Amino acid sequence: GAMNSSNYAELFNNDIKLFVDDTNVYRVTVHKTFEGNVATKAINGCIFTLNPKTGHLFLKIIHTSVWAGQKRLSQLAKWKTAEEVSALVRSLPKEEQPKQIIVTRKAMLDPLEVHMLDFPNIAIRPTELRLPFSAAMSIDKLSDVVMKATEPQMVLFNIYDDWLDRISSYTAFSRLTLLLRALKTNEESAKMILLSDPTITIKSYHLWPSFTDEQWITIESQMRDLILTEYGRKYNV
Amino acid sequence: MNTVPFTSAPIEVTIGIDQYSFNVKENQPFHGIKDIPIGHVHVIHFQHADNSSMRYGYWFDCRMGNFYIQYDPKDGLYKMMEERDGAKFENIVHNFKERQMMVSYPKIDEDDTWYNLTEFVQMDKIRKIVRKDENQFSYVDSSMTTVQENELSDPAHSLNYTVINFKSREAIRPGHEMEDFLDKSYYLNTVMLQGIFKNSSNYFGELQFAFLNAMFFGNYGSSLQWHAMIELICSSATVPKHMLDKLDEILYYQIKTLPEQYSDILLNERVWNICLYSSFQKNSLHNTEKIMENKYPELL
């Protein structure tokens, strides 16, 4: 059933699983038409398919051309997500295929169950966790590859960079969800925290800066403070 | 007009014949039901006074043989049996009739209710859902599980309704996942109507039979089957006009006949709200929508 606080450690066991987030699949700007009506213009999107254990990210870029002449786009986006996840699983070798797929939004369960009928042994699960994977497009390099795409494209990243050399999956996932939670609450402030010291850079083959273990503690602390400040404002408490 | 004689009534029991029912006292000189309309299936059904659990009964058609009821004190129930000796049977009936120990099937002349509930129900189709090929009549009770319920455990005592599963390879063509899930027309028209049932009459007969089993026995899997067969039609954008017209009539008489006090257990809120208000056929069930709105507005 549903993935929650009670069964959190299951994410870091040796059964292959993937999170699927469809938040950024269908993206629009709303604008006024000449006649003063409202219209949307789609922009490039992406499916966020993450192995929480390894950090392997399957960033499937959703090019605006997939919406051309289609109706009920927010509905179609869920089925297009399920089609692309199904295709990704079918493309993996058997020993790499997940045992579970966890969807971050319950509206993905039926579309993904129906697309995965050929895989009865792959459990499709919801989550009670409020995961901040919507903020993936606040990671400059993921944002850059999505917006530059001129056709459908699958790009592979490790969202943990080289962290697993020094820390466990559990700690790497906590760090990723804290960074994404900060980027989601106050993007400008989060990004300032991450680059404020010019001497710490992002390696060409990484997404995040090359922080020492002590600098990660300072950053993580600054991210927790940012999140509470913002929460104090939101709620006046 | 045909007769089902009873050897006796040794235990106190509420006897049903179709939509009618009669209380019989322990050792009351009751010897059966006469004037049963030829041309329809019928169901005789039982609920013991001393254990109102296990409603059970027999689907039969009087054109297929001479049937009687006899209490078996070992198995503790009223059993249907066939009398193969025509002259013995007519002589039993004529005697009981002369001594007026039979109740008369109480059909009002104006009243087409039983015809309307059984319009497409065929005894040969019942015998394929309820497999006991040595009898011409079919036993059903409250507790018998369906083949679908058993998959998700004695196959001999199963109800073999056609399995309907909206999230199955049977229901979803590879590469038409979204189309077939949101518009079940291919599942209804190609798989079920052309493929399995062959025609809408067999589909309606199973639907009507699932309903009657739900209503007369409180058979839970029958209720699931009735709702599934309604939902498959309502969730299809493309249905022949004649099927929609007939479905409205079928459902109207089912809703009309349902005991008012059983709508809480026998009717599924989600299916009915979806079929009448959200589905493709939301506007195609005028009679059904009007009786549901006027008789069960709480459920909606």
Task: Outline the structure in words.
Chain A: Residues 7-237 are annotated as: RNase H homology domain. Chain A: It is found in: Nucleus. Chain A: It comes from Saccharomyces cerevisiae (strain ATCC 204508 / S288c). Chain A: This is Pre-mRNA-splicing factor 8. The complex is a heterodimer of chains A (237) and B (300). By secondary structure, chain A is an alpha/beta fold. Helix content of chain A is 35%, strand content 18%. Chain A has helices spanning 73-91, 109-115, 140-148, 169-185, 187-195, 213-235, and strands at 17-21, 27-32, 38-43, 45-50, 56-62, 100-103, 123-125, 153-158. In chain A, strand 6 (100-103), helix 2 and strand 7 form a beta-alpha-beta unit. In chain A, helix 1 (73-91) packs across helix 2 and helix 4 (169-185) crosses helix 6. Chain B is of the alpha+beta class. Chain B has 2 domains: 1-143, Substrate Binding Domain Of DNAk, Chain A, domain 1 (Sandwich); 144-300, Serine Threonine Protein Phosphatase 5, Tetratricopeptide repeat (Alpha Horseshoe), CATH 1.25.40.550. Helix content of chain B is 41%, strand content 19%. Chain B has a 5-stranded antiparallel sheet with strand order 3-2-5-6-10. In chain B, strands 1-4-9 form a 3-stranded mixed sheet, covered by helices on one side. A two-stranded antiparallel ribbon of chain B has the order 7-8. The interface between A and B is small, with 11 and 8 residues.
